[PDB]
């Protein structure tokens, strides 16, 4: 399990792997771990799937409920506070073993500079949150390898396509260096899913672009 | 004497709703159109309950505000319990009827409100819009084309019974609704629609220059 | 007979508020100005609810003191829950309307109070001031320019309807408010403003030599 | 009919307080002087609430005894919570007003009491004494110089309005208070003072040969 | 109408106590002497509350029996809490007044009882006996020499006002009390004393041949 | 009006007990003899409360059945708490008086019962029997020789006042009781005695051929 | 800690030591452990002082409360039952370490024979009680030595003075054989306290008589 | 931490050290541990400071509350009972490690002999209390050394100044024999605080007198 | 994590480091640990960030709530009591491992001498508080090194700039002697944050002054 997210001028990208493992045996091959909560942010949870899907659904439901009740969407700080409270409320279950660490990436429509409106937030096991400002952040088992790869590869990010390519390459490096992370599948045609958030909203990247990027990266590495 | 108390409560509720303004809800070729007489912008008499459900009411603001909040909580809890596609306007209308009946029976003052629940078809599916009307005592009814509530509704009811044609466009429906309400510019008018053409959420607010261009 | 009880409660509330003094709240080029007739200094009829929200009331001191304390607790809890920027005067006005309606319905004696909630724009942002008025029965309304409450408010309402110009300075607004209240020195006068020019907290008290210099 | 019940309760409370004796509280150059008509020594109508706060009441003994005990508990809990210097007579007067209003509203028999809260300046600090009066219905007011309660208070009110000079000594203040109460030896007289000259606790009881020497 | 209900309750209580017998309590040179008209021996109208406190009552047996049991429990709990020397008759009289007032206010039928609390000095200490009287509505009072309750108390009150001398012996006090009660042998007479000469417990019962020898 | 309600409740209770049959209880040289008019054998108006205590009642069967069950539970719990020798009929009579008073005060319908508690001396100890009578309102009294309750008790009261001699045998006491009740064979007669000659339990039932031989 | 009590014709005596020890260090030198609850009985508790004084005060308060409420004193069986209930209610605290074993000695005014009206009752840790009938009973750390001494010395008990002398000698033997029991102090003038209960009530033995008895015993043992 | 208190004819003195230590490292150098509750008694608590200040404030508040409610001050026995209840209510926290043992010294205005009206009360960990009558008592880590020093030095106590000198010397001996007790500071000018209670009330000893006494003791010991 | 605060004539300064470490791996590089609660005091919490931010927000909210309700700001003693209660209420979580030790520095506007109106308060893990009077205090992992450095360097404090320089030098020494404390960053331009409180209120020190002070200190140490 590895989820990466980096900031590019005018938006933010988010991607994750598609592998679920029960110990050392592979259980899933195309598991989806990146979800869209509402128009201008997406979340990704690494850990137990049973807690991850529940957290995603509950976060989306709470955001929609508040928006319907008050008539206006929550501010970014309010969303961060709600997610932090949700994470903190599961500390006992995390101690038992039901651990889920989410990653939040969104676009701030109430920012003076649209080019620097992208935000990346990481959460701790105890509920603490920190706003990422180095331009990238990764979570999961292979987070360290992906973070090092992004540290070296962030100099080539200029637009959305460059950021997507860097994210795919970081995921490939994490899968190469970690046995719990699943790389691109050229036999079954399974590729990581990505979400791009910009001023127009959050959209889902088509599988064709990710397939071409993965094929190009594999050819280059050969 | 229960009869005297019931009669006095019904008279009080009717007098309370009679002084309120008129809100008109009708179904056109693209969903359900809500038109209301609302001068202030902070106060909204038309809202959204779920993805394909709508809300409309007339009377004391706090009472139907509370009813709206309860309906939203019920809809969200039911959607989180079973599924998002397992919530229909019939359930909301039924729970609203039960709540209004309980208020009418076991409260000092009956609620001076009149609610309407409008549901539209899911995206990619063809089905006719359904409208439900709930009165102060908890009565429920099904109305095929239009629902008129609030104040002296007889002239507007006649004006919408006559010269009304289904499958009309948004502009024609808005013009007919405004004409029937008069019998009126951007200000003091609240317009909302239930656009079945939308993929997930069908509620939309028409305000500003778009409303002026519409009529 | 609910009608007789409601009529008697409304008459009692109106007689209670009618003997109270008049407090005038209006919006000028720099926010909202509160002017009240208050002889004692220990008792304050004007207060601050949040960073950009203000409070004003007239009637029995204990009742609106309790309402003010409840509003402060609600505002602080909501700000700590979601964010400091997620609190608006509309929510406070709505909860005040619900609480006043509940008191009017399910209490032996209705509350003889009349509250006003005034919100201003956040620092660095342009927006027009919003004023809300809540009556004894829980009625809510939106007032664009000025709010007048307490006692024989007809002459002051006329005097503020006439000869009132928006975008006025603090001095001119204070003079107009005092003139309308008369139809009056440092003592027996309470003056507070909502200064949008302030970065975080917009509430300020004008007392002492500064008030005398103002008028 | 709430009006009739309120009128009857007010009349009952006024008749109850009218048969009670008169207690006079005034401020002199060294604090606040309390003078009461109390024949028995086991029963005390004047007490101490905190370091710089005082208590005085007239009416049924048990009612203001309970109010005094509640005020002492509130003051001690507030002092232990935040600090000893964070307790003021304004808070005690406000809570007393709320409690008396609640008793007047939601009790079978209204309380036939009239309380006064007197606070003095802290040691080493100059500030004018503050007196508050609370009636049976929960009304609160601020009185600058003297507070007179209990029975036919009109002659004593006139006698203290006339021929009263501030900054007077303890002896002159006692003589004026006794003269106004008459319009009277050691027995049947209760005398207490709030001596701001004291470092921490300002309450003192004057009884025995000292009282006789004073007058 | 609270006035009518209060008047009827007071009349009922007065009529209930008026048919009861008379019990006389007075203080002599060695404490407080209790004399009562009690034909049966199983029923006792005079009891002991603490080491130096005494009890006396007249009216319905069950009501003051319950009051006596509550007073004993309160006294024992207070003594076990702080100390045996920290219990005084003033606290018992105050709690009895509060309880009787609460019964008079919030009960269907007011209590038809009249209690007296008598305290004496501790052994080795000189102090004058203190007597307190509590009525049906919760009124409290301090009586210097004697307390007379129950029935037509005017002749006994006059007979104890006249021809009464303090510092009298037990025999003379008993004779005076019996003479005033008549205006009467061993049977139908209850006699108890509070002997301050006793080291710890001052309550004593005089019955049998000793009572006959006394008078 | 509490007076009218109390009068009506007392009249209802008196009319209820007046239609009931008469039960006579008296003390002879060997304890207390209970004689009652009871046609059925399944229903018993005379019972045993403890080792030396007895029970007797007249009126509605269920009410004094409940009172009897409560008295038995109280007696057994008190005996298990402290000791078997620490239970006396005075405590049972007192708790019965309190319970009957509480029922008379705070119940819709007062209890139409009249109870008698008879206690005898412990084995090997000489003491006179004690009888207590409790009425519907909770009144308690001590009767030296006999207790008569139920219906027109005046002729039986006169017939037991006259021609009654203490220290009589069981046969003579039974004959006198039957003669006074008439003013009557084995059937329709309930006879029970409290035999102090018994070591631990003094209650005995006389039925069958023994009763016929007795009279 | 040692408390002894024996029966003599016409009454009962009760005495205890005056030593309190915190482990192996001496903390008190004149601690009083024998108390008078009411007119015709006295109690003595060995163990934790904080529990002992509380038990004595509570027992006296309960007896006085019952006497005031009912107008007559409790029977001896009722007093034993109340004390047994009080002891049983503290079993958990005794298990933790807050153990207090009381000893009850009283005079029964409702007995046919006044000469045999004395009663001695001992209580167990679980709340069980047994009426002593051998004529003597001791409780505390040095209870065994005192009981043996009384077993040998009970043949000389004829009246109150003989019983008091036997009790003092038993306490002296217990103090000699036990380091936790304090003997008579000839330097500070501290002597054990004794209570004598007879038909006239319970009284406190003056210190002079105990001093003379202890001095005579010490002289005899020399 | 060491607090000492001894009795002199006509009053009672009370003093304590000014050292707070977190294990083996010094944290405070002038910590105050002797407080005045009301006019005629003062208290001193040794142990955890967080519990000590809370206990002092709560005891003072309770005494003032009772005095205001009833109109008369509590008796000495009532004050002892209240303090014992307060100590007993903290037994669980003491078992965990939050232990606080207070020392009570006061003047009894209701005593026949004013010269013998001084009282010293010591409290145990379980809530038990004992009235001190040897004339002195010490609590804290170095209580044994101070108690021995007072045992030898009590023969020179005749008045208030002699008692104060004896208390200061005992504190100096305790600081010399214990590393957790802080002696007089001749560099920073920190000296132990003392409170004198007599018939006129409780007053605070000025630092100058304690400074002169400590300097004289140091010079004598040199 | 290291936070220092020292007193200078006419005010008080407060500063802290910008390093967050998850065990032995660096997680944050510019973490802010010094916050301003209201006009005349600032607080700094060392330990778990998730508890630190929550404590800061809750303290500020409580102070603002009291000020709005009563109309007057709390006294300094009241603020200390509230903070001590807040710290004491988290003792169980601290025992589990969620420990947060705050440091309070403020200006007393109700003091006779404005030049000596600065106050420094330190809090213990059990809720105990002590008013600092040596002129300086440090909290965190490297508190000892910073305290020693301030002990040697406090003689050069005369005004605000001198105090700021001393605080920066103490932080530099603590970072040099402790691997968990982050020193000035000359590559990424990250410098410690400082807050100055005086009679005019609490203000935030601009990063430029701290940068120049750190550069001068580094040049001097070279």
What does the DSSP assignment read for C107-143? Answer: SSS---EEEEEEE-PPTT-----EEEEE-TT--EEEE
Phi, psi (5° rounding) for residue B59? 135, -145
Tokens of F13: 């209770």
H161-171: buried (b, 16+ CB within 10 Å) or exposed (e) per residue? ebbbbbbbbbb
Whether chain E has a CB inside 8 Å of the CB on F105: the answer is yes
Distance between CA atoms of A171 and A183, rounded to whole angstroms? 7
| Nearest Cα residue to E85 out of C97, A12, H77 | H77
Nearest residue to G106 (alpha-carbon basis) of G170, G202, G33: G202
Q: Does A113 touch chain C (CB under 8 A)?
A: no
Helix (H, G, I), strand (E, B) or coil at C71: helix
- Residue pairs spanning F and G at CB distance below 8 A: 19
In the sheet with G34-38, reading across from the earlier edge strand, the strands are: G34-38, G41-47, G100-107, G118-123, G129-132
Torsion over CA: H174, H177, H182, H187 (sign): positive
* Burial class (CB within 10 angstroms; exposed 0-12, middle 13-18, buried 19+) of B120: buried
Smallest CA-to-CA distance from B55 within B43, B63, B65 is with B65
Question: What is chain F's Cα-based Rg?
Answer: 17
Q: Which of G191, G195, G193, G194 is nearest to G215 (CA)?
A: G191
Tokens encoding G221: 């043992």
Closest in E44, E47, E76 to G65, CB measured = E76
* Separation between Cα atoms, residue I5 and residue H218, nearest integer Å: 37
Residue B98 and residue B112: Cα distance in Å, rounded? 15
Rounded CA gap, H196 and H5, in Å? 10
Closest CA to D176 of D165, D190, D189, D186: D165
What the block records as the tokens of G84 is: 């047994």
- Residue H222 neighbours by CB distance under 10 Å: 5
C214 CA to centre of own chain: 21
- Half-sphere exposure (CA, 13 Å, Cβ side) for I137? 23
- Label the pairing between strands H129-132 and H118-123: antiparallel
- Interchain contact, C83 vs A75, CB within 8 Å: yes
Helix, strand, coil percentages (3-state) for chain C, rounded to 5, are: 40, 25, 35
Range list of β-strands (E), I67-135: 100-107, 118-123, 129-132
| Strand residues in E7-77 grouped as ranges (E) | 23-28, 31-37, 46-48, 53-59
Distance between CA I132 and CA I136 in Å, rounded? Answer: 7
Of B45, B9, B64, nearest to B191 by C-alpha is: B45
Report yes or no: A193 and A202 within 8 Å, Cβ to Cβ: no
**Phi, psi for residue I54 in degrees, rounded to 5:** -60, -45
- Which residues contact residue I183 at a Cβ distance below 8 angstroms, ignoring those fewer than 6 apart? I17, I171, I172, I175, I176
Q: Which residue has the tokens 């008592």?
A: H137
Chain C: which residues have CB within 8 Å of chain I?
44, 47-49, 69, 72-73, 76, 79-80
- At residue B161's C-alpha, the angle toward residues B156 and B164, to 5°, is 105
Angle, alpha carbons H98-H103-H106 (nearest 5°): 150
- Phi then psi for residue C140, to 5 deg, are -125, 150
> DSSP assignment, residue E45?
S
Domain count, chain E: 1
Cα angle for residues E107, E109, E112 (degrees, 5° grid)? 115
Secondary structure letter of residue F60 according to DSSP: -
Strand partners, F36: F23, F190
Dist CA C185 CA C180 (whole Å): 14
CA distance F149 to F56: 10
Task: Give yes or no for A70 touching C (CB within 8 A).
Answer: yes
Could you tell me which chain H residue has the CA closest to the CA of I123? H50
Q: How is residue F125 written in tokens? A: 């100890």
H190 at I interface, C-beta within 8 A? no
Pick from I61, I69, I71: CB nearest C80: I61
CA G134 vs. chain centroid, Å, equals 16
CATH code of the domain in which E18 resides: 3.60.20.10
Chains with at least 3 CB pairs less than 8 angstroms from chain A: B, C, I
Q: Do chains E and G touch (3 or more CB pairs under 8 A)?
A: yes
Q: What share of chain E is helix, strand, coil (3-state, %, to 5)?
A: 40, 25, 35
Alpha carbon distances (Å) from D110 to D17, D60, D68, D71, D99: 11, 11, 17, 19, 11
**What is the phi/psi pair of residue H53, to 5°?**
-65, -40
Chains F and G touch (3+ CB pairs under 8 A): yes
Q: Which residues of D touch H69 (CB under 8 A)?
A: 69, 72
- Interface contact A65-B72, CB threshold 8 A: yes
The whole-angstrom distance between I100's CA and the closest CA on chain H is 16
Cα–Cα distance measured from residue C208 to residue I78, given in angstroms and rounded to the nearest whole number: 29
Residues 6+ apart with CB under 8 A from E132: D42, E89, E90, E93, E116, E117, E118, E140, E141, E142, E143
Query: Closest Cα to residue G1, out of G197, G135, G192?
Result: G192
I99 touches chain A (CB under 8 A): no
Residue tagged 């009813």 (tokens): B67
Cα distance between residue C107 and residue C52, in whole Å: 32
Token pair listed for H207: 């630092």
Q: Which two tokens stand for residue C60?
A: 């029995």
* Cα–chain center distance at G20: 16
Query: Measured over all CA atoms, what is the biggest interatomic distance in chain F, rounded to whole angstroms?
Result: 57
In 3D space, the residue among G171, G132, G137 whose CA is nearest the CA of residue G151 turns out to be G137
Q: What range does the domain containing C205 cover?
A: 1-215
Residue D117: partners with Cβ closer than 8 Å, 6 or more residues away: D49, D53, D54, D55, D89, D92, D93, D96, D131, D132, D134
Six-digit token string for E174: 């008993």
> How far I32 CA sits from the closest chain H CA (Å)?
27
Closest residue on chain C to D3 (Cα): C12
Phi, psi of G129 (to 5 degrees): -130, 150
| Separation between Cα atoms, residue C171 and residue H67, nearest integer Å | 55
Q: Distance between alpha carbon F137 and the CA centroid of its chain, in Å?
A: 17
CA distance E5 to chain F (A): 7
Picking from B9, B62, B58, the residue whose alpha carbon sits closest to that of residue B156 is: B58
Q: How was this structure determined?
A: cryo-EM
Tokens of F44: 């018993």
State whether residue C98 sits within 8 Å of chain B by CB. Answer: yes
Angle between helices B61-81 and C89-105 (to 10 degrees): 110
Q: Rounded CA gap, B100 and B109, in Å?
A: 12
CB-based contact C195:C31 (threshold 8 Å): yes
Q: What is the rounded CA–CA span in Å between residue E189 and residue E192?
A: 10
For I61, half-sphere exposure in the C-beta direction (CA atoms, 13 angstrom radius) is 19
User: Resolution of the deposited coordinates, in angstroms?
Assistant: 2.9
- Phi and psi (nearest 5°) for G191? -135, 155
Tokens of F138: 């909770």
Cα–Cα distance list, C74 to A77, C88, C138, D63, G215 (Å): 19, 12, 18, 34, 81
Asked if A86 reaches chain C (Cβ–Cβ under 8 Å), the answer is no
* DSSP secondary structure letter of residue E144: S
Q: Can you give chain D as a three-state secondary structure string?
A: CHHHHHHHHHHHHHHHHHCCCCEEEEEECCEEEEEEECCCCCCCCEEECCCCEEEEEEECHHHHHHHHHHHHHHHHHHHHHCCHHHCCHHHHHHHHHHHHHHHHHCCCCCCCEEEEEEECCCCCCCCCCEEEEECCCCCEEEECCEEEECCCCHHHHHHHHCCCCCCCCHHHHHHHHHHHHHCCCCCCEEEEEEECCCCCCCEEECCCHHHHHHC
Q: How far apart are CA A102 and CA A97, in angstroms?
A: 16
What one-character DSSP code corresponds to residue E126? -
- Return the residue matching tokens 């100058």: H208
Please give the Cα distance from G45 to G205 (Å, whole number): 19
The single residue listed with the structure tokens 């009742």 is C63
E84 DSSP 8-state letter: G
Helices and strands of chain E, counted as H and E runs: 6, 10
DSSP G142-198: THHHHHHHHHHHGGG--SHHHHHHHHHHHHHHHHHH-TTS---BTTTTB--EEEEEE
Distance between CA atoms of residues F194 and F209, nearest Å: 20
Nearest CA-CA partner of D101 in D118, D116, D113: D113
DSSP F85: G
Phi, psi dihedral angles at H156 (to 5 degrees): -100, 10
Task: Produce one character per residue of F119-157: b if its CB has 16 or more CB atoms within 10 Å, e if not.
Answer: bbbeeeeeeebbbbbbbbbbebbebeebbbbbbebeebb
Backbone angle region of A184, left / alpha / beta, with phi > 0 → left and psi within -120 to 50 → alpha: beta
């Amino acid at each position: 399990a590895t989820i990466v997210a980096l900031k590019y001028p005018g938006g933010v990208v988010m991607a994750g792997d598609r592998r679920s493992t029960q110990g050392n045996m592979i259980s899933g091959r195309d598991v989806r771990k990146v979800y869209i909560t509402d128009d201008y942010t997406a979340t990704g949870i690494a850990g137990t799937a049973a807690v991850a899907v529940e957290f995603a659904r509950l976060y989306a439901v709470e955001l929609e409920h508040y928006e319907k009740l008050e008539g206006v969407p929550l501010t970014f700080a309010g969303k961060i506070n709600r997610l932090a409270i949700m994470v903190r409320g599961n500390l006992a279950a995390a101690m038992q073993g039901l651990l889920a660490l989410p990653l939040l990436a969104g676009y701030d429509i109430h920012a003076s500079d649209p080019q620097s409106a992208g935000r990346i937030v990481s959460f701790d096991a105890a509920g603490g949150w920190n706003i990422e400002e180095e331009g990238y952040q990764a979570v999961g088992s292979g987070s360290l390898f992906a973070k090092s790869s992004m540290k070296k590869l962030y100099s080539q990010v200029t637009d959305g396509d460059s950021g997507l390519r860097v994210a795919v390459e970081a995921l490939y490096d994490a899968a190469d260096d970690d046995s719990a992370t699943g790389g691109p599948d050229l036999v079954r045609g399974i590729f990581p899913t990505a979400v791009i958030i910009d001023a127009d909203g959050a959209v889902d990247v088509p599988e064709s672009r990710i397939a071409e990027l993965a094929r190009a990266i594999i050819e280059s590495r050969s | 004497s229960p009869e005297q108390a019931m009669r006095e409560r019904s008279e009080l509720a009717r007098k309370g709703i009679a002084r309120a303004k008129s809100v008109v809800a009708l179904a056109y070729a693209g969903g359900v159109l809500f038109v209301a007489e609302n001068p202030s912008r902070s106060l909204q008499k038309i809202s959204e309950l779920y993805d394909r459900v709508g809300f409309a009411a007339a009377g004391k603001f706090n009472e139907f505000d509370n009813l709206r909040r309860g309906g939203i909580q019920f809809a969200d809890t039911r959607g989180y319990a079973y599924d998002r596609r397992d919530v229909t306007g019939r359930q909301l209308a039924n729970v609203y009827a039960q709540t209004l009946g309980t208020i009418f029976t076991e409260q000092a003052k009956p609620y001076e409100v009149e609610l309407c629940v409008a549901e539209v078809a899911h995206y990619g599916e063809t089905k006719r819009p359904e409208l439900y009307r709930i009165t102060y005592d908890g009565s429920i009814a099904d109305e095929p084309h239009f629902v008129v509530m609030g104040g002296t509704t007889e002239p507007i009811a006649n004006a919408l019974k006559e010269s009304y044609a289904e499958n009309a466009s948004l502009t024609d429906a808005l013009r007919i609704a405004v004409a029937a309400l008069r019998a009126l510019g951007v200000a003091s008018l609240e317009v909302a629609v239930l656009d079945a053409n939308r993929p997930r959420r069908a509620f939309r607010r028409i305000t500003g220059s778009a409303l002026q261009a519409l009529l």
